[PDB]
Structure formats: C-alpha cells, structure tokens
Amino acid sequence: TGHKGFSYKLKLGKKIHQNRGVPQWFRMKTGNTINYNFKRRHWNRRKMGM
Amino acid sequence: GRRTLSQRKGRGSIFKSRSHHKLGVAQHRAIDFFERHSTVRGLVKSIEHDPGRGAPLARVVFRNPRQYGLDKELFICAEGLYSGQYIYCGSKASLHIGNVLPIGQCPEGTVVCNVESKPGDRGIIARASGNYATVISHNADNETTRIRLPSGAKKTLKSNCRAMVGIIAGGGRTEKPILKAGVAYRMYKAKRTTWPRVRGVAMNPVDHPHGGGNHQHVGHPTTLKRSSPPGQKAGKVAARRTGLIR
Amino acid sequence: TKGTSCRGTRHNKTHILCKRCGKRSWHLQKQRCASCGYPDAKMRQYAWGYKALRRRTQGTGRMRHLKIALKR
Amino acid sequence: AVRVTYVRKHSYNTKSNGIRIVKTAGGNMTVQHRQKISNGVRCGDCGCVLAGIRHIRPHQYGWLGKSKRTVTRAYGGVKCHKCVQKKILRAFLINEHNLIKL
Amino acid sequence: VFLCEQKANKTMIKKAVEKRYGVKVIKVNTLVRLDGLKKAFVRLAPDVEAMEVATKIGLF
RNA sequence: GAUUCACGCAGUGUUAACGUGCAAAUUACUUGUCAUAUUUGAGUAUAGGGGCGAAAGACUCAUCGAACUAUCUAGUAGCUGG
RNA sequence: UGAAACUGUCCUUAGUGCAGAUCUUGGUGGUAGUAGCAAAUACUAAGAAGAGGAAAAAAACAUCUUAGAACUGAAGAGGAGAAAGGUUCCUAAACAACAUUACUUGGAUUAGGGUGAAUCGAUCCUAAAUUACAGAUGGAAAUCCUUAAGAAAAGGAUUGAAAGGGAAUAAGAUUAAUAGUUCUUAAUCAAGAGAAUGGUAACAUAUCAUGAACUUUAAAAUGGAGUGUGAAAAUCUACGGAAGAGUUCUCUUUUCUUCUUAACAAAAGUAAAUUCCACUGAAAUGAAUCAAUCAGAGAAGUGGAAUUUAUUGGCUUUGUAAGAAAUUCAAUGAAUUGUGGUAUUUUUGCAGUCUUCAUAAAAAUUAAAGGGAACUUUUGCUCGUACUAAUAACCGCAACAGGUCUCCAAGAAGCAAAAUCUUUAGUUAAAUAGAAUAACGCAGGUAAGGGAAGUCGGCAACAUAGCUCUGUAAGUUAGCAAGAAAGAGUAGCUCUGGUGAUUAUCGAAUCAGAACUUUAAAGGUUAGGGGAAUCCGACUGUUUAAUAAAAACAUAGCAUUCUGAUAAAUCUAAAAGGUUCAUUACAGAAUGUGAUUUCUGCCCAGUGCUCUG
RNA sequence: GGGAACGGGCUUGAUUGGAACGGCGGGGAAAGAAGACCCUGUUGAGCUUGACUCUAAUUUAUCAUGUGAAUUUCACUCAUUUCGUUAAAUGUUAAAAAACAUUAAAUGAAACAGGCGAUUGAAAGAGAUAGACGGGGAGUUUGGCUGG
RNA sequence: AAUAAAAUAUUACUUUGGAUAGUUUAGUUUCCUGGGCGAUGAAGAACGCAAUGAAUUGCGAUAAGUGAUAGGAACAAUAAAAUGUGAAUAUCCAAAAUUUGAAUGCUUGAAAGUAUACUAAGGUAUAUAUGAUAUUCAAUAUCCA
Numbered sequence A: 001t002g003h004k005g006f007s008y009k010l011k012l013g014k015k016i017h018q019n020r021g022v023p024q025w026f027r028m029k030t031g032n033t034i035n036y037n038f039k040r041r042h043w044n045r046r047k048m049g050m
Numbered sequence B: 001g002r003r004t005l006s007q008r009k010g011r012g013s014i015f016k017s018r019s020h021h022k023l024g025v026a027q028h029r030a031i032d033f034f035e036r037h038s039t040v041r042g043l044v045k046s047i048e049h050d051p052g053r054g055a056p057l058a059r060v061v062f063r064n065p066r067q068y069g070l071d072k073e074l075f076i077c078a079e080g081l082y083s084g085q086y087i088y089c090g091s092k093a094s095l096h097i098g099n100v101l102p103i104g105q106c107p108e109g110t111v112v113c114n115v116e117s118k119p120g121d122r123g124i125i126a127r128a129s130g131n132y133a134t135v136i137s138h139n140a141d142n143e144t145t146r147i148r149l150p151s152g153a154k155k156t157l158k159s160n161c162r163a164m165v166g167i168i169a170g171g172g173r174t175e176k177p178i179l180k181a182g183v184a185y186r187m188y189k190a191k192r193t194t195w196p197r198v199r200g201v202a203m204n205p206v207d208h209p210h211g212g213g214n215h216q217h218v219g220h221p222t223t224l225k226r227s228s229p230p231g232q233k234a235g236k237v238a239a240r241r242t243g244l245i246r
Numbered sequence C: 001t002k003g004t005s006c007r008g009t010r011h012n013k014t015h016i017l018c019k020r021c022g023k024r025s026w027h028l029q030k031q032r033c034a035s036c037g038y039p040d041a042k043m044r045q046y047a048w049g050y051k052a053l054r055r056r057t058q059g060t061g062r063m064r065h066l067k068i069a070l071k072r
Numbered sequence D: 001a002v003r004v005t006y007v008r009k010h011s012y013n014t015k016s017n018g019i020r021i022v023k024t025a026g027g028n029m030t031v032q033h034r035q036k037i038s039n040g041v042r043c044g045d046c047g048c049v050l051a052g053i054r055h056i057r058p059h060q061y062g063w064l065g066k067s068k069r070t071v072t073r074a075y076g077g078v079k080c081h082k083c084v085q086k087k088i089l090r091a092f093l094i095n096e097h098n099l100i101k102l
Numbered sequence E: 001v002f003l004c005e006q007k008a009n010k011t012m013i014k015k016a017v018e019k020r021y022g023v024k025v026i027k028v029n030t031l032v033r034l035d036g037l038k039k040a041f042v043r044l045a046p047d048v049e050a051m052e053v054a055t056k057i058g059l060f
Numbered sequence F: 001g002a003u004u005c006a007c008g009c010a011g012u013g014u015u016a017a018c019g020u021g022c023a024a025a026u027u028a029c030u031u032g033u034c035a036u037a038u039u040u041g042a043g044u045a046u047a048g049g050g051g052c053g054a055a056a057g058a059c060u061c062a063u064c065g066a067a068c069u070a071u072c073u074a075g076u077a078g079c080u081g082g
Numbered sequence G: 001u002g003a004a005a006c007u008g009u010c011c012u013u014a015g016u017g018c019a020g021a022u023c024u025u026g027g028u029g030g031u032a033g034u035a036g037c038a039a040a041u042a043c044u045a046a047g048a049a050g051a052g053g054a055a056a057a058a059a060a061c062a063u064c065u066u067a068g069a070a071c072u073g074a075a076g077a078g079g080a081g082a083a084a085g086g087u088u089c090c091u092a093a094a095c096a097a098c099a100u101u102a103c104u105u106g107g108a109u110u111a112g113g114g115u116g117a118a119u120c121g122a123u124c125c126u127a128a129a130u131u132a133c134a135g136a137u138g139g140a141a142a143u144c145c146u147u148a149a150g151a152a153a154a155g156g157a158u159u160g161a162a163a164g165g166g167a168a169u170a171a172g173a174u175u176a177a178u179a180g181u182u183c184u185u186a187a188u189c190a191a192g193a194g195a196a197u198g199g200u201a202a203c204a205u206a207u208c209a210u211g212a213a214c215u216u217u218a219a220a221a222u223g224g225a226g227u228g229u230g231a232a233a234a235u236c237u238a239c240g241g242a243a244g245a246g247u248u249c250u251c252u253u254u255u256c257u258u259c260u261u262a263a264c265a266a267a268a269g270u271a272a273a274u275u276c277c278a279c280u281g282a283a284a285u286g287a288a289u290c291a292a293u294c295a296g297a298g299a300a301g302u303g304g305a306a307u308u309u310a311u312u313g314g315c316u317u318u319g320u321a322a323g324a325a326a327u328u329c330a331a332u333g334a335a336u337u338g339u340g341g342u343a344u345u346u347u348u349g350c351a352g353u354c355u356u357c358a359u360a361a362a363a364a365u366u367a368a369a370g371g372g373a374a375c376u377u378u379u380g381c382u383c384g385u386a387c388u389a390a391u392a393a394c395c396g397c398a399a400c401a402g403g404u405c406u407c408c409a410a411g412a413a414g415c416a417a418a419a420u421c422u423u424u425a426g427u428u429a430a431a432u433a434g435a436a437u438a439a440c441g442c443a444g445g446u447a448a449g450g451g452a453a454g455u456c457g458g459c460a461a462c463a464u465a466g467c468u469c470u471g472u473a474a475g476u477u478a479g480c481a482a483g484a485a486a487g488a489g490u491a492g493c494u495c496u497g498g499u500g501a502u503u504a505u506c507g508a509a510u511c512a513g514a515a516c517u518u519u520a521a522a523g524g525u526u527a528g529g530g531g532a533a534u535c536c537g538a539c540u541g542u543u544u545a546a547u548a549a550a551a552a553c554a555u556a557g558c559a560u561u562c563u564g565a566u567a568a569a570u571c572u573a574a575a576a577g578g579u580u581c582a583u584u585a586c587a588g589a590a591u592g593u594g595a596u597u598u599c600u601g602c603c604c605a606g607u608g609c610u611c612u613g
Numbered sequence H: 001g002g003g004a005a006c007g008g009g010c011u012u013g014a015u016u017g018g019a020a021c022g023g024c025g026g027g028g029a030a031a032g033a034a035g036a037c038c039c040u041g042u043u044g045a046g047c048u049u050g051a052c053u054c055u056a057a058u059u060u061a062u063c064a065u066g067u068g069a070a071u072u073u074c075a076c077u078c079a080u081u082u083c084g085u086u087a088a089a090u091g092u093u094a095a096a097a098a099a100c101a102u103u104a105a106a107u108g109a110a111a112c113a114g115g116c117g118a119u120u121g122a123a124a125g126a127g128a129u130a131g132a133c134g135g136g137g138a139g140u141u142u143g144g145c146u147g148g
Numbered sequence I: 001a002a003u004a005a006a007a008u009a010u011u012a013c014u015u016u017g018g019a020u021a022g023u024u025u026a027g028u029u030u031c032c033u034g035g036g037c038g039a040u041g042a043a044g045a046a047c048g049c050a051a052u053g054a055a056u057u058g059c060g061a062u063a064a065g066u067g068a069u070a071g072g073a074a075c076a077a078u079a080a081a082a083u084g085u086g087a088a089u090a091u092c093c094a095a096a097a098u099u100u101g102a103a104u105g106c107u108u109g110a111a112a113g114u115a116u117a118c119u120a121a122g123g124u125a126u127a128u129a130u131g132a133u134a135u136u137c138a139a140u141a142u143c144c145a
Helices: A006-017 B181-187 C050-054 C066-071 D081-101 E012-021 E050-057
Strands: B042-048 B057-063 B070-072 B085-087 B100-102 B111-113 B133-135 B144-148 B154-158 B162-165 C015-017 C024-027 D019-023 D029-033 E025-032 E038-044
Touching (some): B111 B162, E012 E038
Antiparallel strands (some): B057 B070, B100 B162, B133 B144, C015 C024, D019 D029, E025 E038
C-alpha cells in the first residue's frame, strides 16, 4: 500500500530478496541437487498473505 | 427454543441508550449548610433542549459560597421560567415559581415538581414533561409529609426533601397525533432500540411463545403469573382485570 | 449473491501478524492472538490440537542457550 | 478546460480538504488548500458577535498585533458595549438603593 | 550519495561525512530502502567541490 | 414520509439468453425505484440452546429448523456392498 | 534382455494368494482431431526490425513510424487518490514455458536502476468504544469495576480516526521512473540566542504602550430544505488587434489555435451584504423584500464605525514578475501579451424564510477580560513516498461480461449531468481468422385481407407518447379523482409588435401575430395506451442473498396489564456486577388489532389471572 | 415365442457391403442423485403439550444469638440495605436590576462531641433443609398382527 | 461376387509409464544411563552476516566466525589471500551475544516514539507481589508529662 508501517516495509523487503533463483555457481558443485528454488512465488500467482 | 426479544434486551449489546448528545444529569444541587439553613441565588442563564426528553433543561449558574468561582448547575425547567431570572434554592426561600423549597415548608395543596424521594438524592418524583405532585398534609410528630404522585398513589416523605415549585415545562406533548412512521422513528433518536415491534403471533414457535400454527392466534391465556420464568413471561403479567372498561 | 458477487468488498483485514509467534493471527478487534495466545502470559496450548503442539514447541527453533546447558 | 487533481493524499471532499482552483503561467490550472470559515467572538450575556475583532482561527490570533484582538474598553473583548453599559448601571443604581435601605 | 546504516539519523550522518572526509555539509536527505539500508544524499558546501571529494573516495 | 426524468440500485415479466455458462446465480430487453423509514465508506459493539431479525426459520465468510475446527472416535448399526 | 546376488529339502513363524467393496493411489484409452477458441461496432496501405507471407490466392500476417478510417464521448475506455496487492514501476538482453492461433509484444524469463519533506500525512487530541496496579467475585480458568471501594492516578489511568480537530510553501525546471520531497527563485511557522494616546460613540494606533495567583467568557464546535445575491473559474459573446495554420477555380475583410501567472505581502482606485454609533423624533402611520420583516425599550433621513466576501484588505492594480511561460521568426538571438457584457453552468461566501415529540460531538490548543503579585543569527530528529486503483496489478482457483469508497469536468440540443454526434485525453488490442451464404438456431425486423377466432391467461409483440389552447364525469376523507376521457394547432422563409438601463445608444432570450412556399410539419434520438366493474391491503416503506416480492412484516390509530424507581422487565456461575436509566408515570416494561367513518352483541359454567374475603 | 409376465444377445423366421459427413429426437426402460412420495428401523433432529422423569428462575416455612423492656407486640443502634458530597458548619452550649465578590486590613472567622451527612434496621438480602410453582430448559418414549 | 482402406489376431523393435528385482546416511518397538532451562533474562519469533547464496546449516555489529587447549597439512564450483612462525577439525572453557519474547520505566497495530537520576551520542537503574535490615513518616489506637 502507499502507507506502510516500518516493521511492515522491512518484511516486504525480505520477501522480494528471497524471491530469487539459485545462483549459477551453486548448481555446479559436486552432488548438488539444488537446481531450482521451490519456495518461490509471484505477485500474480500466489498472494503471500501477509 | 430461542431467546425472545425481552431476553436479549437485558444484555445491552445494541439496546444501550443513544445518550451521546445528552446535556447531562438534570438534578438539584448538593445539600450543604447554605441551603439547609439559608438561601442561595441562582441565575437561569439559558433554557436548553436535552435530547431524548420533552422537558427543557435550564442552565442555572449559582455562586460558590464556600470558595471562589461559579457553581454551574442544570435544572429541569418548570413552566414559566425565563432567561435572566433569579431563582433562590434554600430552606428559607420564598414560595414562587422555580424556587426550590424543602417539601416540609410548602402549604398544603402547594404544587411541587421534581420532588426528592429521600433527602439528598436530588430529584426523583415528578420529573417528566407537564407532570407535578401536589402536597397533601404535614405531620410534625415525625416530620413526614404526604404528597400525591402523578400516578395517583400517595407517598409519605421526610420534610427535608427538596422540591422545585411549579409544574414541569413542555406540557401537553403527547396530545399531538404522530401521523406517520417516520415521525415515530425520529422520536427514538435519543432513546433505546425498540420501535419496529413485531407481534408474537407473527413469529415462529421458537422466537416467541405466541408463535401460532396454521391460523394466526395465541392458543393459551395471555394473563400470566408474576412468578413465570423470564422468557415465557409475555402478554399481561398478573392481570387483575382484562378487557375494555365498562 | 452469496458467492462471486458478494466477494468484492473483502479488503478490511481482520488478522495481522502477531509479535510473539510471528503468524498472521493477531485479531485487530479482539486485541489478542488466536494462535499463540497473546497478551495472555502463558503460551496457548490445547490437548486436542496435538498437531498444533508439534508445529511450535521446545526443540523446533534454534535453542540458542539451551543446546549449551544440556550438553554440559 | 483543464482538469486538475488533488495534490495531497486526501481524496475525499471533507471539510478540512477544501481546495480552490487558480490559473497559472501558461494556462495551467493548479490546486490550493483554502482554509475553513470560522465564527467570531460572542458577548457573554446576550450571545451576539462583537465588533472590532476579526473572524480568524484560534491560533491566528497570536500572530495579530496586541490591539488587533481586543477592544479598548472595560470588559473589552468579552462583552458587547450594550452588555457593559447595563453592567455599570446595575453596579451603581443597586449600591444607591441599598445605601439608604440599610 | 552514500548507503548508511538504518539506525543513524540526519545528525550522526552529517557529522560522519564531515569527520571522515573533512568537508562541510549543509543538507542531508535520507530514505530507507527496502533492503534496510538508508540512502543519504549528502550535499556539500558551495566552496567545496564534490568532484574532488569523489575522486578521493575512488568513485571515478 | 406529494407525481415524475437522470446518475445509481433492485430484480416484475419474457417463466428470453446461458444452462459441462462471463458467472458455484450472470447477461439483454421490458419493469419498478431513484433523499429523509434515503444510499454508502472507515472504526467500534453483539458469537453457538448464543447473536441479529419491519418476521422469510431468514442472516451469522459459497456451511443454518442450530456455524467452522479439533478431541472422545476406528461412535453404534438386527441394515446395503466386498 | 540384464549385470550381483540366489536356489532346492525338513521344521518354525506370518502384515501370505484378488476381478469386483461408486474400493485407495498412480497411469492411460474410446468419445476426439469432436464440442469449442462468436458480447465489448474495425480495420486498411506504405516503410523498418525480424528465421518467421511464403503462394498455382497458402484470400488470414504479431511489434514500431506515417497516412486513411474509427470507438469510449467528458457521471469517459481521461488525469489522480483510500482500502487491497508487493516490485507488478523504468531500462537492456532474451522467447523453453504462460496470455484457448502466433507473437519480434507482455502485468511473463534474466540482470541492473528507482521511492529524497521543518511546511503533505503518521507522530499530538478526543468520539462510539478498549485495557492496566490496588479492590470485589470465583473450586477453577478467569470475570466485574475505569474513578468507584485506594495513604494510588492540581483532580484523575492506557489505547482508539493516514475521511473528525491540527503551528508553517509556492511557481518554473529536471529524471529511462521520484518529486507540495530534488535544483533556481521567492516565502512561512515553532523553540531559542543577541507602567501610552485619539474619537461624543460605535471604535482605532509598520510587537510596542508592564501584568503573577485565582475565576469567567469565547474560538476550536457542528442538522437539513428552499429562495435572492456578491465574487472567481469555465463556456458564450462585443470593439480593436499581433503571430501562425486550413479552403480557394466557385465564393468567403473567411474558419481555427496562442495572447497566462503562484505562495506570501502593498494600498492608486472601488463594491455587495449585515450589525452597531451620533443629530432629530414617525400618525395623514411609514420603511422596505422575490418572500418576509421592522419602529416611541425608538422607524425613515444625513454623517460615521466594525465584520464577512477562497492570503495580507473583497475586485481591478502593484512587489513577487517576465528575467518565467505560451505562440511565432532566424541560425543561440529576436517580436507581441488592450478594454468590455443588464448571457449559461460550477465553486465559495452572505442575507433573512421554513421543519422537527430529530435541536443535529469531545479534547488537545489558543485569545481576551475581572484582579493587582512583583534588526540579525542557530536548530527543526524518527517513519510512508515507485506502481494499478481496474472490461489485465484488489476480491472472486484466471487477462472471469460479477463486486469495490472518492476529487477534476468542453461543444451541438433540450426543461433535462436524458438519447444521438464531436473537441483535449485513451485505444484499434482486448477467450484466433479465411471461404461458402444449406437446414435448425440467438439477436433485430417487416407484411396482403381479417383483427385475440391462438392460448390457462392479449404471454410476446404492435399501438398512445413532447409542447400550446379549449374541455374534463361518477365518487369523495372535500384534500383528490385528473396528464381523466375528448378535440384543435405544431414545418420553411420574410416580416411586425410586447416585455428594460443610461440620457438617441446598448443588452437578454422569451411570448404573440401576419403574409408567401412546400413533399401539410413533435416523432432521427427521448418520448403516458385508455375505459367500466369486483377482491385484498389504509397510504410511503421491508422481506425468503440463489425458484415465493405479496393478499405477508412494519407502520400512525384503537385498546389491554404491571411498576413509585431499593421498582417493572431482565443479563451473569458469582459480584460494592450489567441493560432500559445522562431515566421517574405526558415515564419504563409486556401485549392484541391494524388509517378515517359506523359498531364491538349475550356468556365467569370450564381453563387461566386476580382478591381488600 | 418363452422368459423375472415390454430383449442388442436365447429359439424360429425377415433380412445383412466396407468405411461415415450434415441433420433431426423414436430407442439405448440414455446421463445427472445409495427415492425426496410409501413402508421397516426397538435410528435421529426441530417444535408442541397435565406424555414420563427432572431443572435454572420465582415463592413459602425452619436454622444461623445486637441491646432495653413488658410464641407475639414495642423502643434504641451496633451489625446490614439504599444513597450524597470538594466525606465542606450534624448535635449541644455561649422574588424590582442576566454586574463584581479571591491572594484581608486591623483573635478578626466562638467552643465542645469518641457519630462524614442522611435512609432502612434486627427486619431485609446471600447460604443450608423442606413444600409449591415451573415446556423458560434438559433427557427420553410414543407395542404387535395386518391382502402397503 | 469382390478390394482389405478401416477392423481384428500373433511375434519382434521403438515409444508413453514406472510395476517387478538388487540396494538404504530413514523409520518402528524394546531395554540401559541421564532426565542436566529461566530476571546472570529461558522456550519461541523476527531481522542480519559467506568473495561470489535463493533455501538450508552455522553464527550475532568480534557475523558459514574470535581467543585458549587438543589437533597435525588442507579447501575446491571458480578465481584470491594466508599457512609447520601451525591449514582443516574438535570442546561441559574465556570474550562477545542485534529487535522482541515471563518481558519487567510508560506506550506498542504492521508503532513511528518517549520520562526521570547516574556515568552531545553511548551504557546503566526505575513493572507487580514479596522476606530481612536501615531510614523517613501517619493514626491519640494504649499509656503519659
């Protein structure tokens, strides 16, 4: 919203920081099965409800 | 079963009084020496209209006799009171209109409104619009006086009770026929929530004990004992006589 | 109009995030949290919700100063 | 014919959110927040407005010059000249009446 | 334009720029970015040139 | 708390359209209504043998002649299927 | 085929043998290349980029520029906000997936960038309300009281509004996006720092001109309806122009665009309304408004005073300020920016009138009075600020024809913010198109002669419709019925007259009348069918969200019962506990019938209620 | 035709070319739902009532020991009820006038009480036992045979 | 009377799908030892920190880690740096330990804040009930001059 409290803006800021994919170098490790982020979301698919 | 509308009216959820624009508590002033053994002088600053009652409230402004400053009050307006008036409220006050007197000084047959029920509670009896209580007699043996309440019942009160002389203003209010539904709906602007009243016999059996069957009727006598349980106490409670009076 | 038509005026939030449990369970009008029993001092635990105990109880977090004492 | 928009976040035409549209350089039309209308002072006995004191906001009286918020007279600023002419005669005729009564 | 810590304000930032770079500051504008970092728009005095301060920091 | 037009709102009739739809109740024309018992926003109050109801057993998060969720609970069944 | 475990006999043990439980879970068919991809008027030509219009018409082709043609039509398909969403915002690269074809496009993939406040809000105050210590109640959980019970808080505690109250900011410019937030210029507020005169009177003096305790007054602070009017803006228009653009073989001194100015302050000139003051004292009564209303507790007249009128002082004018901006010319430099209106609408104030058995908030905070105790400079902290605000950013499982609170508002035409068309602005894409023009369909129509014979029933459809004049029954609560019913007129062009201001000029749409002509005229759009009877409900009103909208519910009226307030009703397990009650019989509580008029008959045995027996 | 008495399949016949496009409603006792009408449950639920058995509310009697006295009737306050204030002169001695009134001049402004000021009062209310009332409320039941 | 386009039947190879066979850093039950949190601030929640991290693990402004004691030559996806003058690793140790939370100075909604005293920013103490001690008071409640 236009008017968000301080403790509410910093929680939104973490939810856009966590909405990022796997770094390229991480997937190239040995025995690394973490190829995709399954905790991801989007603004039009799933409302995070917060 | 259910809880009828008389059972939900006791909790006070939406049935609380709409007393938000009300001026305040209309009553005499606190008892003291200057009123018990002398007289004070009050100025009727202005007549006001306390919402939710048909008797105007007058804003009397006394002087603090023990300290420095004004002692503003709020008196129910007896009929005939005007702005700029001087009303004296004491035991030795003169028997005029609006002058508060102890009930034990008024001659028999004097008209007193807003009479106390016990010396010091500041007004109980005869407060509505256009109503008054008339003194009957006196009894110096036990300092008690008889008066006739506006209901016709006669009550015995101590002679120290204060009672403003006269009848209450705004009389003859109900003689006007409310013509519409809207006028009756606006009358409850500053009262509780009870106007549109749905009949018991136009109700299903759960809501009211009068909920009828295939014909709209009661089915059992409406005259009930006083000792009925709350919820079934409907109709006429402890009726000595019913029907039109001939 | 008890279905799709009446679902258009839902924009006045009722439950906001709580402070002691972190779930969206703080009832604004009742002023108490429905999941962790806020201002009430005791954490709200009921025996019929045996699953609601193992979702948040001792051991489910970091155990910052308790994993030390038990080791000693 | 230029259509303007509220410049503050207030979007409702409340009493505190009155605006006036004025012209501006180049034919642009802008929005200004105009203040509310207030009542003047009133005599303490008759309830009539007093002359010589402007009808402005309660705090704006502080910025006025010390002679721009009173009237130079006994009970000047709290009672009308009729409200005071009667005070003097009451305070004098009464004193003469009870001077000889007792 | 810097990236200060959130818990500062327009007073302990005005001194921190003046003390760390030996300059004069006449205006600080701050905002809290989403990440939590506070971006401060420190405006130096007219006599001091920000270009020579910027090269000293290493921006250019 | 007069008669009507309009912005809006409703839902009288076609028992029209659609009826694996735009829609888990909507669309078109026709009709009524369109400021005082008027329409509406936000905050606050009232919670399950309870609330609220200009009264239809109606409304109480697509659930009401007794809401949703969990524990007793793998309830009991002389009855149907395997 | 496969690549590291396994088999036979005896005994023991079992979570041991499947075709069914509408069985549970997982996968896959026929239906089937079928039904579909049809509301929202609409696209075409040239060019660019691109693998992505080739071709025996493979008749269709996504994004961007221009031209043509159009729609929403200013209560918008325009410009912005609150709630909700949370990165959707902007740019670059890129197209495996997703937007019922495709996409070079995207609210989609990846990576960067973006949200600037002493003046806007939060913060501060209180509203309906909410919650603490002590106290009371309670087996218990916990409940009640919120200033009453208190050695607590001068008089009473906490929370409660981004729509209520509130100290102070504007114009121009800038960015790929932020700007009452940045830059230039120009201001404002708060907190500091460095015992006076004038006027008869109303009252007045670029801070001035002392003013403590205590007290009071006032502002903050308040319903609605209708009329009249001042002012500004928009639209329209008159006189005189400056610059540019459009039409021109047929004419038009023609049609269009621009000609502007803030916050804050000053006083050349000059208004409307209201309330007061001084002189005199009204009758032959006057003064005045659209309406009213006012006067010997004092009218009219003359002279004054104060206040309101979007910041100072309302309008013009001035500083700000032309140096800005708009429109042009030349290739950074040059030109201009008068004066009116007895026109319509909107906005904001003022004046009285009307209506209530409705009288239509509180505090923070500020000023004055009664009383007499003793020009400069510094700082202004924290939090929000991007974006949509919807036929694609919210809620509906989604780019759902549903739902969702607001501000700004051009022309034609009309009584109308109606229907229909256009200007500034937005868009041509919004679940795919081409061909053929069968049936049966959905939506929209028309018709010979008859006109409800169709059918449960005039269902559906057709027909009357605006305005002016004439006329208008029975019944009736005397108000209504009534737009009753019924009849006449209406176009175009050229004329005439009536309705005003100033001393002949000037301005307004409005009414009436007369010639002449025609295709004989409200009808493109908007736009009552009428009558005679019967039943119910008195009327306006409300209801089964999603099959019942009424003859039901309500309602004003009539009537009945209890109650003197420590009461009646009545919530709680309990309570110095709670509701009507900030109350007091013209009141509180419990009921039946349902306007007005007329009338409510006989019955107290039975069952209830009551009794002074 | 018989059949579970209205077959696509069985028996006897009529008759039969492979694939399937547009239509249209006769058949598939077509699809949608463990019939909602009826009956059987020793299965429920709402509602009603002198159905059975209880219960909150209301009411009546007894117990719970204030003093002075002459089971009952009086007087007092001391528990107790209902109140009111800024706990602000209790008890006893010596209506002409919508105005102001305060921080005292020189003890002024009297003392004492075992009661802040009143009302009710040994009655009332709360508890225990007992009788009455009580669909306001809880729990439950409402046989069988039977040409349905 | 005829064709095998459709249809049907068997086998082989391929596809959609993951049954069967082999394995298991995971579980279930039983028994043994303990049953060791908290105003010195617990359990839980939130935010933040890697050279390149989104999760997760580890940790708390000394941050995927510091000091000490044991330990003996690594880490690795890639580039860097450090390293027998001691890299990895381990621990009932020392230092440190953000905002909250019984939450405790007042307030706390998604709230931004804020008062007094001690030592401009920084750190401390100040909630309720409670025992003991010390100090300051109130009541004529009992005596008494």
